[PDB]
Ligand binder design. Structure first.
Ligand SMILES: O=P(O)(O)OC[C@H]1O[C@H](O)[C@H](O)[C@@H](O)[C@@H]1O
Ligand SMILES: O=P(O)(O)OC[C@H]1O[C@H](O)[C@H](O)[C@@H](O)[C@@H]1O
Lengths: 170, 294, 294, 170
């Protein structure tokens, strides 16, 4: 049911965020010794980043930016404005600090219920700003006003931020 | 709880900066949109206990017919505002400078010349000009004044109104001129830039005969239980850092001395616009003028 | 072949843009540097056939004691210049707006207050203030007018001159203040900004009692064989794109209507500077005034 | 003598410039098939660039700039402001256009006469802007005026630009 889908999604995103934090902790004592102008160390960063992406059912895209470097697995160059921003980190990389952004484009679960059940998903912050939408009626950056709409919905707070996941129908 | 704001501004201008205030002060801000005078009329009939907290946008210093619906106030920052546009009304704090413009479709224009209001009267442009209801909108009313201030003849206003199609909403003028339904229209800078930046064939004309400059205001609404953050909002909107932003991010024209303008791309700087001076600016109050020309 | 230019400007301001003119018009430009009045005297005694072609910089509309040494000329662009600073002199075209400022060493300042000419008279600051010879420089002379215009008392000019050290060159004032040899000095905006940007502990003060604003000029020099590109040079220096240059790259204040100012740091925009109005602006001519404060 | 040294240096830089034209031509048909986001093709460009650097006696540094790429052999990060800008090129690299700047820091001939003869070098354009100096009393970007100029000197035009090589004695 919808209530089951939000619990499972919340728990899955929590596990996901949990793994990101584990990644950043582990490798802090591994980055300070890597140089991202060296093609052997860049390969080492991609391998670890892609390893993380695929320990997860959710579809995630990383952006590692800094001085004359842009590293990502968004090979088709999808617009990040339509994706959920999951986290952000500043990593010390010997030669400079590089910013790491993790984006969530979709989940196999949310993609499945949207296809089979027409149950859509929203993520909103405490001021009703829309941070994620797979329904074309809503667009990220705008406001979600629940009163304008009549839907079945169940919502839940996510552990990693003051955000609410909303799964709804109609 | 929720801090409600009446505004005729388009969301794309005020929504981003109010958002920055929401998560700076931990407040929810709701915006009630609509034409200036429609909001003021709906507000007037609204119960004291159901009224919002703040009104921003519109030429408030000159078109509030019901002062009793507002609380006297002026931010401490008026000292840093441009001397000529400081509000001399105790309910309104000045907030932005907004040129009223003529917007021209450059795909349709051809060789027709549109340099001001007189050119809009070329018989070839009859039925192909759009404007917004001067009774309900700040934009239509301010344009009618400027038309009147050309030669101070009410016949010029009527000749235009017979020559052009009146619309209900200011934002409908630029949209329909931008999409090629009208050759030109009367609008405002900030809504014309908006459509021009999306790629539409929109030319911004500052009328030579004289350009009306709108001094947008902010006023506290008189209600039963005013929101405790609403005075912080007024101080926030008149702060330097927010004005600098409005300048930097939206090409708005700031009310403050200490905020310089920004550079070109079809938005002239103030000193290069042909403004109606204090001299030729008609004197008549709001309701008198609407009745005079109807 | 060579197009010679007299200028009191520092090289770091004019060499780059004049270089761009050399490349665009295939001309060699030589600059003859010096204090404003030294150049005008050297030029006056200079033989007609060895005189340069162009004079740029200094308050030419007010301090040329020998008009016959110049050719009357004003560019076609005066139409686009700010009304209040268009030259009413047929030998001088207006080029830039340059505030005169007090520069304060913030390492030495401590808690002393310096907000104007009157504060420079605090006995603690005796012998620790620097300024440039008003007989030879535009900067010293324009500051003496500003000191004089406070309360129109020649005693104020003399009290300052007794209180401060006179230097031969304007550029020596900011240099020695910046390096900690003087607590404060009387300089102008661009030279202070130059040193502030190199990292020196320099604070720029616009005197509250009334800031003098210099309208820099450009003038054609009367000589035997004027360079054929020298009128192209004047149009170039007053052009919108070059001015937009002086603004973006150097923080200069443009003479044109259609060039906006720039949001810089610790440099004020014109509308936030306490300028002496044309009203209180002393009248007496240059030579007269100088003889009066001797 | 000075006149000998200008001819040999004027001839060395012509030969040098000649080799860079040949490089740009040879690989107009080679570079259009390389992608500088791929670490095998970056190595292919570096190998070709470093081969060029060492086919001639002058000390040269390349800068290949573009979208999130900066490639150079200026490993100690010497200030290019003190080096002779010598050629510039826009190259088509399949994924984008990249600007290639070649800088000359010194030549073994000018370094030699500077040490053994105290003969210094200037390169100036037709407007007397200084484009290269190994004498600390002149600085690039400023002007040289043959009025204040009081030395023994011979000058020669360089083939590749409207520039003049001046060798002078103090
Ligand atoms: O014309 P309205 O529908 O009343 O909208 C009014 C808007 O445009 C006017 O020109 C004002 O300058 C703006 O401050 C206001 O946001
Ligand atoms: O040494 P000087 O004659 O004062 O030259 C420096 C002058 O350059 C510019 O023209 C400024 O407008 C003057 O304020 C400044 O004083």
């Amino acid at each position: 049911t919808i209530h089951q889908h939000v619990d499972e999604s919340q728990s899955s995103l929590h596990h996901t965020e949990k793994q990101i934090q584990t990644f950043i902790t582990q490798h802090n004592n591994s980055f300070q010794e890597l140089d991202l102008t060296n093609h052997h160390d860049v390969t080492a960063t991609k391998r670890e980043l892609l390893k993380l992406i695929h320990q997860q059912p959710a579809t995630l895209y990383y952006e590692l930016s800094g001085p004359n470097q842009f590293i990502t697995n968004n090979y088709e160059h999808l617009n990040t404005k339509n994706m959920y921003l999951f986290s952000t980190h500043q990593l010390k990389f010997k030669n400079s600090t590089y910013m790491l952004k993790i984006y969530m484009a979709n989940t196999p679960r949310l993609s499945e219920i949207k296809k089979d059940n027409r149950q859509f998903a929203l993520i909103v912050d405490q001021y009703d700003n829309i941070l994620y939408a797979n329904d074309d009626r809503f667009t990220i950056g705008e406001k979600y006003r629940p009163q304008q709409f009549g839907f079945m919905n169940e919502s839940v707070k996510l552990n990693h931020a003051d955000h609410r996941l909303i799964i709804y129908k109609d | 709880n929720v801090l409600t704001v009446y505004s005729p501004y388009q969301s794309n201008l005020i929504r981003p900066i109010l958002n920055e205030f929401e998560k700076q002060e931990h407040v929810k801000i709701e915006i009630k949109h609509g034409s200036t005078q429609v909001l003021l009329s709906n507000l007037h009939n609204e119960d004291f206990s159901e009224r919002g907290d703040v009104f921003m946008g519109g030429v408030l210093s000159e078109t509030i017919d019901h002062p009793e619906d507002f609380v006297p106030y002026q931010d401490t920052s008026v000292t840093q505002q441009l001397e000529d546009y400081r509000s001399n009304n105790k309910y309104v704090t000045s907030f932005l400078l907004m040129p009223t413009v003529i917007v021209v479709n450059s795909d349709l224009q051809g060789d027709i010349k549109i340099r001001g209001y007189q050119d809009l009267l070329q018989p070839i442009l009859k039925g192909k000009i759009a404007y917004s209801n001067p009774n309900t909108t700040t934009t239509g009313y301010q344009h009618m004044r400027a038309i009147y201030s050309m030669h101070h003849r009410v016949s010029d206003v009527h000749q235009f109104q017979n020559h052009a199609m009146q619309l209900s909403k200011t934002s409908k003028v630029i949209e329909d001129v931008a999409k090629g339904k009208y050759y030109a229209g009367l609008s405002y800078e900030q809504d014309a830039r908006t459509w021009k930046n999306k790629g539409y064939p929109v030319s911004i004309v500052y009328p030579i005969e004289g350009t009306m400059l709108n001094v947008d205001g902010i006023a506290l609404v008189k209600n039963a239980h005013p929101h405790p953050k609403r005075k912080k909002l007024v101080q926030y909107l008149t702060s330097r850092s927010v004005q600098q932003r409005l300048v930097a991010e939206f090409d708005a024209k700031s009310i403050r001395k200490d905020v310089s303008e920004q550079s070109d791309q079809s938005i002239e700087n103030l000193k290069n616009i042909p403004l109606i001076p204090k001299s030729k600016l008609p004197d008549i109050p709001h309701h008198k003028f609407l009745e005079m020309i109807q």
